């Protein structure tokens, strides 16, 4: 009845608020807060019995950030296929969201691809870097931004390349944090935070 209706409304509010909170902790570099908010968001998501388009987008955003946060953790498994690395998993999520904002979407995508290779190379995982390359760059003959640059670097089998300093993990994090600032600005006035802010300054 109207009870279930209201619980769905409340759940929508909770999801939005938890995304906002997760976004802030990500931007702030507040690791413990981030993990706790992640846990809350995950449980709230599991509890949902319906999804609007905005809720699906919010879930993708949460998934995207957790994979990005785990990007250097090559022992985190985000896919059933155990070979998929966290940054590859981030890429899969990224393909499902913010495509209408093409310039920022392309920049972030490129940086994630570069770093998906970089984290392997810098660990001395040269064979894994080739395997990641084959997965994220499609047909060997197809052209994609930075692809031919990355093939050259992989083939040289060195743990360090200067190209990776210019397109570094930190560069990737900063462009992503820009997108996060956008989500923050879009969601900073969602019912729960708006209401809670009014209580605080009172």
């Amino acid at each position: 009845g109207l009870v279930a209706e209201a619980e769905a409304v409340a759940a929508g509010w909770m999801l939005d608020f938890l995304c906002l909170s997760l976004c802030r902790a990500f931007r702030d570099g507040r690791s413990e807060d981030f993990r706790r908010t992640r846990n809350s968001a995950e449980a709230i998501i599991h509890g949902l019995s319906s999804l609007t388009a905005c809720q699906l987008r919010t879930i993708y955003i949460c998934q995207f950030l957790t994979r990005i946060a785990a990007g250097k953790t090559l022992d985190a498994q985000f896919e059933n296929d155990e070979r998929i690395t966290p940054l590859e998993s981030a890429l899969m999520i990224w393909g499902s969201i913010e495509k209408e904002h093409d310039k920022l979407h392309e920049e972030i995508q490129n940086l994630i691809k570069i770093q998906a290779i970089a984290v392997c190379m810098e660990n001395g995982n040269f064979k894994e870097a080739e395997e990641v390359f084959e997965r994220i760059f499609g047909d060997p003959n197809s052209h994609m931004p930075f692809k031919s640059k990355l093939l050259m670097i992989i083939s040289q089998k060195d743990t360090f390349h200067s190209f990776f300093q210019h397109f570094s993990y930190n560069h990737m994090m900063e462009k992503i944090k820009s997108y996060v600032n956008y989500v923050l600005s879009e969601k900073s006035s969602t019912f729960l935070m708006k209401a809670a802010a009014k209580v605080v300054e009172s």
């Binding site: 995950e42 949460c62 957790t66 953790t73 022992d75 985190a76 498994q77």
Partner: peptide, 12 residues
């Protein structure tokens, strides 16, 4: 499936 929290790679 895996949602927000990753599986950990195990030794078995």
């Amino acid at each position: 499936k895996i949602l927000l929290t990753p599986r950990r790679r195990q030794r078995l």
